[PDB]
Structure 1
Amino acid sequence: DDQMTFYEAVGGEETFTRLARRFFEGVAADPVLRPMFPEEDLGPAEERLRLFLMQYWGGPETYSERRGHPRLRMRHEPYRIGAEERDRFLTHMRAAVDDLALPAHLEQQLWEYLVYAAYAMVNVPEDAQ
């Protein structure tokens, strides 16, 4: 038969719209991570992740066309990101993923990227690589 991108497979945009929602929802409820972002009305940050992930899994290039070529740890250098940090991020991401209730194969693929991507992002001298 025909072939498809992960984006279309996990059911397209609404999926990612949902993922980021249940994510920041928990981020809101987290003390250390509420601080992490300055001020309030930080619902546009939600849009970014959303647009990025859409783009990563083979969706709309939208993210680039507003935020350019994704320089990830550049945009993460501003921040004091350590274990405690990442761990809490991931706990909100774990929660966010179970809510999508994907087939194990896809879920395994999505979650694994985000597990690396958050372990990668850590910038303080804590890790082994």
Structure 2
Amino acid sequence: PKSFYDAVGGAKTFDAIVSRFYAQVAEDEVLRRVYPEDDLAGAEERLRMFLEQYWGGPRTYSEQRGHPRLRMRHAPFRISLIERDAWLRCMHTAVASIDSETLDDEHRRELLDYLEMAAHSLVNSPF
């Protein structure tokens, strides 16, 4: 279709990204100890639902979670440039794992531009 979500391959693509992302998080010395060790599956699910929604996919995230209120969702954690950069490192790996046939050069840039902006907007701590 027309939606960014469908253009990039819909649910299959977002599951692939968020899934490979959280696998990176597991091996990430920084983020390993940020994400609640006991709730890894649920965390992945919420991030996927959110990104699906954001890019014009299902609006399930909002029905389940409310307005994103990301600032307040991340308030429990001390996110400095170090966490921001680790998150982006993991996400860049995840996104780079998607072939160019599925994910355009134009769609890739748009996505990465958003992620880069969003991650910085959520920094809430000097260390």
Report the counterpart of residue 65 of structure 2 in structure 1. 67
Instruction: State the Cα distance separating 1:41 from its structure 2 match.
Output: 4.2
Give the whole-Å Cα distance in 2 for the aligned partners of 1:88 and 1:121.
Answer: 13
Count of residues in Structure 1 that have an aligned counterpart in Structure 2: 124
CA distance in 2, matches of 1:118, 1:110: 12
**Cα RMSD, aligned residues only:** 1.3
User: Which protein has the bigger helix share?
Assistant: 2
Identity among equivalent pairs (%): 54
Partner residue of 1:37? 35
TM-score normalized by the length of structure 1: 0.91
Match of 1:121 in 2: 122
The offset of 1:30, in angstroms, is 0.9
Q: Paired residue for 1:109? A: 110
User: How far has the Cα of 1:38 moved from its partner?
Assistant: 2.4
Alpha-carbon shift at residue 22 of structure 1 (Å) = 0.7
Secondary structure in 2 aligned to 1:49? Answer: helix
Unaligned runs of 5+ in 1: none
In 1, distance between residues paired with 2:31 and 2:80? 12
Which string of whole-angstrom CA distances, capped at 9 and with x for unpartnered residues, describes residues 14-46 of structure 1? 110101011000000012211102232411100
User: Distance between the aligned counterparts of 2:89 and 2:66, measured in 1?
Assistant: 28
Structure-1 separation of matches of 2:41 and 2:15: 12
Q: TM-score, normalised by structure 2?
A: 0.92
After superposing on structure 2, the runs of 4+ consecutive aligned residues of structure 1 that deviate more than 3 Å are none
> Which segments of 5 or more consecutive residues in structure 2 lack a partner in the other structure?
none
